[PDB]
Amino acid sequence: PHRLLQQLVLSGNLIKEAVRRLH
Amino acid sequence: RLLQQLVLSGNLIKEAVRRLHS
Amino acid sequence: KVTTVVATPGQGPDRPQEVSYTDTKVIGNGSFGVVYQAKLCDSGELVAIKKVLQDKRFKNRELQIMRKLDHCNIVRLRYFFYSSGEKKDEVYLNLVLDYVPETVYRVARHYSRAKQTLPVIYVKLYMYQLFRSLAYIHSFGICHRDIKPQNLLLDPDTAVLKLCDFGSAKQLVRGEPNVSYICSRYYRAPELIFGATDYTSSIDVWSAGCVLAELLLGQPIFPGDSGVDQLVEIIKVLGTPTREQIREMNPNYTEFKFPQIKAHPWTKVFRPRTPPEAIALCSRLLEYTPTARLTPLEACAHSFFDELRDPNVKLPNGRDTPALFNFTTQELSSNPPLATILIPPHAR
Amino acid sequence: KVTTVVATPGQGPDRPQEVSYTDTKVIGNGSFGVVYQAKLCDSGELVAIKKVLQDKRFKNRELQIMRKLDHCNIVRLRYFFYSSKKDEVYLNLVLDYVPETVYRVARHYSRAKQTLPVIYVKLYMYQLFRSLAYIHSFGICHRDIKPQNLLLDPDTAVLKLCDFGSAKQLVRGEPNVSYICSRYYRAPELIFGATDYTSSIDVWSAGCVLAELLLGQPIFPGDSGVDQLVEIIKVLGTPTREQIREMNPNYTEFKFPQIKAHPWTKVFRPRTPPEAIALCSRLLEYTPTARLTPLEACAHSFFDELRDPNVKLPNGRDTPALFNFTTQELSSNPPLATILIPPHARI
Ligand SMILES: O=c1[nH]cc(Br)c2sc(-c3ccncc3)cc12
Ligand SMILES: O=c1[nH]cc(Br)c2sc(-c3ccncc3)cc12
C-alpha cells in the first residue's frame, strides 16, 4: 500500500477498501 | 444503633466485608 | 380568594411589607412540614411556600442561610413570614421561594421509565450548574448536607437548575463538631458512615459524585438497605480503604485488622457507551480521602464540561444554554486562576 | 584517538572554536547517516554526533531548526561542524548524549508482561507535550513523534525530544509531503493524502504514544499504509463527511459503509486509569482542529498529580523541572500559566 494507497486516494475508494479489509 | 456500635467498637469494616461475602 | 400577610423580603431592606397571594395548593408533605404552591397577586409570579413549625426563642438555621444567598443556581428566598396555628404557642415559619416546576429526580425517572439513558448533554448541564451552586455556598462556609436528585429543581424549558431544601444546611466552623447521621443514605459520604464529626463541605462533592454516577447508570450507584449496607455498596466499588484513608475520613476511628477487598475498575462500573470524560470526572469525586476530591470550581473546569464552553452548543429542544459563565468574583474567590478555563473567549 | 575539529556553538556566538573529543563509538546507522557517541576532552561529558551527507549548495533544515531551540525537554545542539570521497561534505551535529529511550523502557515492562507505572506515564507524556508546545510556537512541526525519539535519563526521569531530521517549519498555503511520520504514529489526514496539514499531526502521534504506554503495545499496528487506516477504523469507526473534509478537502468519497466507533473504555484494559482514557480520546480525533493543543494537554486533569507539592518518583528522588515555562512556550494561550504553574512553584 504505497502505489495501492495512491490509487485508493486518487480513485476515491480508500474508506470503501479499508472497510472491506476490516472483515 | 448497629452502625453506631460498630463505629465505636472499631468493627465496621470487618462486618461490612462479611456481609458482602454472604 | 386572597391571602394577605406581613412578610419580610428575603434580601435587601429588612423592612416588613404587605404581600398578597392566591391559588394556594398543596405540593409537598413530610416530617419537615408542608410546601404549598401559590400565585403572587402583585405580579402573577408562581411561588412555593414552605411552612415549618419553628420554636422561638430560637434561630432557624435554614432561614439564616437562605437570607445570605443570591445566585442563579439557588432557589431564591423572596419573602419570609411567621404565622400562628390557633393552639396558643404554635408558631410557623413560612419561606416564600421562587416556584420551579420540575426536578432532576423526575426528569431522570422519565428517561429511565421510557428505557432511555439521559442524554449526555443534560448530564453536563445539570452537573455543571450543581457544582457552580456548591462553589457559591461553600465560599460562605455553608455545607448543604443533603445533595440528591430530588433536591435539584429544574426548569424543563430553559434547563436552569436550582438547588433547594436548605433544611439540613449548616455553616461549618472548623473545630466545632457536626452531627454524623446526616444526608440521605444513598448520597452519604463514607466519612459520615465512619462517624466523623470533623467533616467539611467536601461531603457535598461526594453526594454530587453520586448524582453524576446515577445519571450515567439510570439508577443510584450506592443503594444500601441500611447504614452498614451503605458501606458494603461503597466497598463493592472502591474496595476497602487504606489505613491512611481511614485516618483522613475519621481520625477518631481505628481498625487494626480487616480483610482487604480490591477496587472494582471504574470502566466496568459504567456501561460501555459511557463517555470516558464522565467516568474520569466520577473517579475524582468518589474518593475515600475527603481532601482528594475535586473542589466544585475544579469540577466546573473539568474536560467533561468542555462542550458547554463551545460557542455553538444547543439544547436538544433547540434553545440556547442558560447563563453558564457569568461568574462573580465571590464565585471565583477560592481559585481565580481557573477563570482561564471557566470563562471561554467568546463570553468575555 | 583524540579528534580535534573547528566547530560552531549551537546557539551561538557563532564564532568557531576548537573542540576535542575521544572514545568515539558507532551507536546508530541508517539511510539518514551515522550517529556516534563521544567524550569531550575538556568536560568528560558524553555527546552524540550525528553525521549526515550534505548538499553544499543548499541549507540543512535540521540544522536551521536545531539552532533556534533551547529547552530542557529538547536534545541540545552543543556544536556543529563540517567534514569529511573528496568533494563530499558531511554535516556533524554534536548533541548531548542521553542513554535511554521511552521505547526501550516501555519494552522492558512489556516483555515482563506488565504495565509502566502510571506516574511515569504522566511524567513522560507531560514533558513530551511541553516540548511540542515549544517547537509548535515557532511553527515547527516534528513530523516523527514516536517512542524511539523520546530520550530518557533513567535516573532523573528527564525526557528529551530528539531527531529533527523530518522536522519542518510549516507555512500555510505551502504544501508538505504526505508520506511522513512512522506508520504506527501517522495521523489519518496524512494517510488520506493531506498536504495542508498542521502541527496537530504531532498531537495525534503523541496520542498514539500515550495509548501505547497504556496497552503495553502500539494502538494502531498497521502492516502497510491502507492497513493503518483499517487499524484506526477498528477504534474510531469511519470518519463522517465533515471529518473527511477537515482531514483532506481535496479528497471525496461519495459512498462508503459507515462504522460506529468502538468504546474507548473497551480499547484499554479494565484497570486503565479513566483519566488517561479521557485524555487519549481528546488526542485521537479524526478532526485535526478538535485535538488538544500541547499546552491544553499539559493543563489536563490527568497531570494533576504532577502539580502536587508532595509528588515523588518511585525511587524517592524529586521529579524533574516541570514548571519553568517561558513566554515562548506559553504564547498560544498565555493566561493558562496560572493553572500550569502551581502556587508552590512560583519564586
Ligand atoms: O425545601 C423543600 N423541602 C421539601 C419539599 Br417537598 C420541597 S418542594 C420545594 C420547591 C418546589 C418547587 N419550587 C420550589 C421549591 C422545596 C422543598
Ligand atoms: O537524530 C537521531 N537519529 C537517529 C538515531 Br539512531 C539517533 S540516536 C540519537 C541520540 C542518542 C543519544 N543521545 C542523543 C541523541 C539521535 C538520533
- Rounded to a whole number of angstroms, the distance from the CA of C241 to the nearest CA of chain D is 18
Q: Tell me what percent of chain A is helix, strand and coil, each rounded to the nearest 5.
A: 80, 0, 20
Q: How was this structure determined?
A: X-ray
Task: Report the alpha-carbon distance of residue D267 to residue D289 in Å, rounded.
Answer: 23
Task: Report the alpha-carbon distance of residue D138 to residue D328 in Å, rounded.
Answer: 8
Domains of chain D: 18-99 (3.30.200.20), 100-347 (1.10.510.10)
What is residue D5's DSSP assignment?
E
Contact call for A9 and D226, based on CB within 8 A = no
Task: Report the alpha-carbon distance of residue C282 to residue C305 in Å, rounded.
Answer: 13
Under 8 Å between Cβ of C85 and C92? yes
**DSSP letter string over D180-234?**
-S-GGG--HHHHTT-SS--THHHHHHHHHHHHHHHHSS-S---SSHHHHHHHHHH
Give the neighbor-by-neighbor strand order of the sheet with C152-154: C102-103, C152-154, C161-163
Half-sphere exposure of A8 (CA within 13 A, CB side): 20
Element (H, E) at D265: helix D264-267
Contact call for A14 and D252, based on CB within 8 A = no
Q: Which residues of A touch D238 (CB under 8 A)?
A: 15, 19
Nearest partner of C282 among C267, C271, C263, C301, judged by Cα: C267
Task: Report the alpha-carbon distance of residue C305 to residue C64 in Å, rounded.
Answer: 33
Query: Kind of pairing, strands D168-169 and C161-163?
Result: unpaired
The angle that helices A14-22 and D225-236 make with each other, rounded to 10 degrees, is 70
Please identify which residue in the block is written with the cell numbers 472491506. Answer: A20
D193 is in an annotated binding site: no
Bridge partners, residue D271, by sequence: none
D44 is in an annotated binding site: no
- Count Cβ atoms within 10 A of the Cβ of residue D29 and give its class: 0-12 exposed, 13-18 middle, 19 or more buried: exposed
- Count Cβ atoms within 10 A of the Cβ of residue C198 and give its class: 0-12 exposed, 13-18 middle, 19 or more buried: middle
| Cα four-point dihedral sign C113, C117, C118, C119 | negative
> Which B residues, 1 through 22, put their C-beta within 8 Å of a C-beta on chain C?
2-4, 6-8, 10-17, 19-20
The gap from C-alpha C332 to its chain's centroid, in whole angstroms, comes to: 19
Residue at D85: amino acid letter? K
Q: How many C-beta atoms surround the C-beta of residue D194 within 10 A?
A: 23
Residue burial D82-110, b: 16+ Cβ < 10 Å; e: rest? eeeeeeeebbbbbbbbbeebbbebbeeeb
Ligand 2 pocket check for D116: Cβ under 6 Å? no
Task: Report the alpha-carbon distance of residue C251 to residue C290 in Å, rounded.
Answer: 12
Q: How many C-beta atoms surround the C-beta of residue D266 within 10 A?
A: 12
C-alpha pair distances (Å), C333 with each of C140, C210, C336, D240: 10, 26, 6, 43
- Rounded to a whole number of angstroms, the distance from the CA of C193 to the nearest CA of chain B is 8
Ligand 2 pocket check for D50: Cβ under 6 Å? yes
Backbone angles phi, psi at C306, to 5 degrees: -60, -40
Site to substitute for ligand 2 among D32, D47, D50, most atoms within 8 A of C-beta: D50
Residues 6 or more apart whose Cβ sits within 8 Å of residue D123: D157, D159, D306, D313, D319, D320
Under 8 Å between Cβ of D93 and D67? no
Under 8 Å between Cβ of A14 and D230? no
Neighbours of chain B (3+ CB pairs under 8 A): C
Element (H, E) at D281: helix D274-281
**DSSP letter string over D15-53?**
--EEEEEEEEEEEEEETTEEEEEEEETTT--EEEEEEEE
| Cα four-point dihedral sign C207, C211, C216, C217 | positive
Residues 6 or more apart whose Cβ sits within 8 Å of residue D112: none
Of D263, D282, D336, the CB nearest to C303: D282
Q: How many C-beta atoms surround the C-beta of residue C186 within 10 A?
A: 18
Half-sphere exposure of D175 (CA within 13 A, CB side): 9
User: Cell for C113?
Assistant: 421509565
Under 8 Å between Cβ of C217 and C266? no
What is residue D328's DSSP assignment?
H
Q: How many C-beta atoms surround the C-beta of residue D63 within 10 A?
A: 16
Under 8 Å between Cβ of D164 and D66? yes
Nearest partner of C238 among C184, C280, C283, C207, judged by Cα: C283
Q: How many C-beta atoms surround the C-beta of residue C39 within 10 A?
A: 17
Resolution in angstroms comes to: 2.5
Please identify which residue in the block is written with the cell numbers 499496528. Answer: D221
Under 8 Å between Cβ of C11 and C70? yes
Task: Report the alpha-carbon distance of residue B3 to residue D232 in Å, rounded.
Answer: 52
Contact call for D193 and A18, based on CB within 8 A = no
Contact call for D338 and C341, based on CB within 8 A = no
The angle that helices D274-281 and C276-285 make with each other, rounded to 10 degrees, is 140
**DSSP letter string over C51-115?**
EEE--SSS--HHHHHHTT---TTB--EEEEEEEE-SSSS-EEEEEEEE---EEHHHHHHHHHHTT
* Catalytically annotated residue among D96, D144, D155, D163: D144
Residue at C88: amino acid letter? K
> Which D residues, 248 through 267, put their C-beta within 8 Å of a C-beta on chain C?
263-266
Using only C-alpha atoms, chain D has a radius of gyration, in whole angstroms, of 21
Residue at C115: amino acid letter? K
User: Cell for C337?
Assistant: 486562576
Residue D60, SS3 per DSSP: coil
C123 is in an annotated binding site: no
Q: Which residues of B touch C259 (CB under 8 A)?
A: 14, 17
User: Cell for D315?
Assistant: 525511587
Task: Report the alpha-carbon distance of residue C67 to residue C14 in Å, rounded.
Answer: 10
Q: How many C-beta atoms surround the C-beta of residue D60 within 10 A?
A: 16
Of A4, A12, A21, the CB nearest to D253: A12
**Between vectors from CA C28 to CA C23 and to CA C31, what angle results, nearest 5°?**
135
Contact call for A18 and D226, based on CB within 8 A = yes
Backbone angles phi, psi at C336, to 5 degrees: -55, -40
C-alpha pair distances (Å), D164 with each of D50, D53, D68, D74: 11, 15, 12, 10
D30 is in an annotated binding site: yes
Task: Report the alpha-carbon distance of residue C176 to residue C166 in Å, rounded.
Answer: 20
Half-sphere exposure of C144 (CA within 13 A, CB side): 31
Q: Tell me what percent of chain B is helix, strand and coil, each rounded to the nearest 5.
A: 75, 0, 25
**D318 among known catalytic residues:** no
Task: Report the alpha-carbon distance of residue C106 to residue C154 in Å, rounded.
Answer: 9
Residues 6 or more apart whose Cβ sits within 8 Å of residue D295: D129, D133, D329, D330, D332, D333, D336, D340
